[PDB]
Amino acid sequence: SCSLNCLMPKHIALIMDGNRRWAKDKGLEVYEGHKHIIPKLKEICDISSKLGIQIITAFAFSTENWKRSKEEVDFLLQMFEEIYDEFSRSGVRVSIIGCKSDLPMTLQKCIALTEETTKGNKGLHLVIALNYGGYYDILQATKSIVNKAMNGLLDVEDINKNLFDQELESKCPNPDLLIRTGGEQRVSNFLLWQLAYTEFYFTNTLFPDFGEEDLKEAIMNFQQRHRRF
Amino acid sequence: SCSLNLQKLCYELMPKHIALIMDGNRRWAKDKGLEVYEGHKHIIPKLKEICDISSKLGIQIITAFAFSTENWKRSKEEVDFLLQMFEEIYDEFSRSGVRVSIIGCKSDLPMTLQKCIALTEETTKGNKGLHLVIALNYGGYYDILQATKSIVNKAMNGLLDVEDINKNLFDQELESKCPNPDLLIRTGGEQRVSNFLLWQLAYTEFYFTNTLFPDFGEEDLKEAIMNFQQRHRRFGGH
Numbered sequence: 436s437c438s439l440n441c442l443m444p445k446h447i448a449l450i451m452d453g454n455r456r457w458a459k460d461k462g463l464e465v466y467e468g469h470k471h472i473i474p475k476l477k478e479i480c481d482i483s484s485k486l487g488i489q490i491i492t493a494f495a496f497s498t499e500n501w502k503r504s505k506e507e508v509d510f511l512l513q514m515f516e517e518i519y520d521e522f523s524r525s526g527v528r529v530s531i532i533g534c535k536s537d538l539p540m541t542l543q544k545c546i547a548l549t550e551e552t553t554k555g556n557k558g559l560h561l562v563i564a565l566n567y568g569g570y571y572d573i574l575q576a577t578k579s580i581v582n583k584a585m586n587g588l589l590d591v592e593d594i595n596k597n598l599f600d601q602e603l604e605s606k607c608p609n610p611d612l613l614i615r616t617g618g619e620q621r622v623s624n625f626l627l628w629q630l631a632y633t634e635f636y637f638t639n640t641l642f643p644d645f646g647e648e649d650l651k652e653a654i655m656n657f658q659q660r661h662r663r664f
Numbered sequence: 665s666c667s668l669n670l671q672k673l674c675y676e677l678m679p680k681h682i683a684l685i686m687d688g689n690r691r692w693a694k695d696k697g698l699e700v701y702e703g704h705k706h707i708i709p710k711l712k713e714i715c716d717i718s719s720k721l722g723i724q725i726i727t728a729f730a731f732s733t734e735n736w737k738r739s740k741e742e743v744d745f746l747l748q749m750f751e752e753i754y755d756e757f758s759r760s761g762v763r764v765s766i767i768g769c770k771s772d773l774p775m776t777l778q779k780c781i782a783l784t785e786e787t788t789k790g791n792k793g794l795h796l797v798i799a800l801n802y803g804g805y806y807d808i809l810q811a812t813k814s815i816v817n818k819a820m821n822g823l824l825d826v827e828d829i830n831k832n833l834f835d836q837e838l839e840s841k842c843p844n845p846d847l848l849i850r851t852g853g854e855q856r857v858s859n860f861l862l863w864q865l866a867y868t869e870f871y872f873t874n875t876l877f878p879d880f881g882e883e884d885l886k887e888a889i890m891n892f893q894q895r896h897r898r899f900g901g902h
């Protein structure tokens with residue numbers, strides 16, 4: 436029984452793609468590219484904070500990236516501990532979404548500490564999606580709703596867009612604009628439910644080259660789209 | 665509790681499944697100086713032509729976005745024009761070798777539209793050719809929510825456990841099922857998905873064109889397919 440008849444973007448979703456190709460093209464080891472991820476992201480938060488943007492959700496590690504080599508996966512998961520150094524004494528408030536229990540317990544602790552030391556910052560809110568996927572987010576929300584029903588807390592007739600939204604890890608307000616660096620035109624199992632009405636902007640610029648002028652261009656393209664539609 | 669480390673993706677030089685957002689009909693009629701709904705009167709024939717072109721190329725499924733949850737907010741004279749025009753699906757396809765199904769909330773439509781849809785499905789259910797799925801009163805939120813309700817009702821009746829809830833279970837309860845679209849084509853200039861497929865597009869390749877849908881023909885479709893053929897799909901690995 437169905438029946439069908441949340442100028443400057445508030446929330447930006449960021450897919451931080453193209454770091455290996457950047458390094459290989461410069462004659463560098465692949466890992467040199469990955470070392471630019473956290474510092475560039477910090478730089479983008481400072482630029483965005485000054486433009487009036489309020490939320491950034493950034494894709495750092497997907498649930499499919501476990502298919503890469505053991506060497507590359509081990510390097511990346513060790514490298515993400517620098518989140519604490521780069522952000523713990525900044526003006527940014529930091530959260531992580533994703534399945535934290537699959538990560539090394541040392542990373543779990545840096546994450547827990549980064550969230551703790553920055554929780555009171557009133558500026559920009561940076562959400563880092565680490566071991567995250569849209570399938571995972573929808574499935575964990577479904578399991579939560581199933582447990583509430585089995586405990587007598589809701590009826591099937593109470594399941595609606597609002598209820599489901601409150602069980603997801605990324606909630607309303609959803610991204611107004613998605614920026615994906617690195618040339619590819621696909622969402623790669625990022626924020627599936629949350630991107631239903633988001634504007635998609637794809638640039639060929641590789642993530643370690645994405646700078647203030649490139650961000651400004653994406654925002655101008657976004658403002659042009661709204662005069663039109 | 666969660667665990668995503670150890671190991672299920674429904675994707676394939678030729679896309680097996682193409683999703684299609686048909687946009688730009690009213691702008692088309694204005695430039696051509698015709699009545700506001702004449703662009704809409706081209707949807708179904710153009711759709712039949714696209715199925716014919718695609719079937720020759722080797723494409724197996726087309727899912728076409730005909731009427732969203734948000735199109736209920738268009739003017740009620742424009743809503744009636746469309747829903748009565750969709751009744752022409754029967755003349756166009758019941759002849760063909762095309763198999764036709766409709767996804768979406770069918771119980772909210774005119775009973776005349778409900779019977780016409782049932783009759784088209786039954787008549788073509790045996791056809792062996794390309795599978796055309798028409799999303800009518802559909803949306804991505806709707807599909808995920810109705811799948812969730814069906815999973816809750818099973819858990820409440822002891823037919824499954826919370827630990828059985830995984831991507832393949834969810835896949836089997838959604839109205840748009842595996843295999844998912846390899847390529848999405850959106851005509852009409854916009855670069856977004858507007859609550860069409862959500863779950864199904866996780867690794868779909870996107871192709872956006874400014875061409876308005878009534879101008880979208882054989883050469884444009886082959887342009888979209890050649891563009892898709894140049895892409896490199898990595899699915900998170902290397």
Ligand SMILES: C=C(C)CCOP(=O)(O)OP(=O)(O)O
Nearest residue numbers: 451494495496623898899900
């Ligand atoms: C954390 C991120 C940015 C995941 C998406 O990038 P990928 O490189 O894994 O996406 P594909 O090109 O394989 O689809």
Ligand SMILES: CC(C)=CCSP(=O)(O)OP(=O)(O)O
Nearest residue numbers: 451452453454455456495496
């Ligand atoms: C998946 C992560 C950690 C970053 C996205 S960039 P990458 O490693 O996928 O590099 P390429 O896209 O292969 O150039």
Ligand SMILES: [Mg+2]
Nearest residue numbers: 452453454617
């Ligand atoms: Mg990549």
Ligand SMILES: [Mg+2]
Nearest residue numbers: 687688689852
């Ligand atoms: Mg339109």
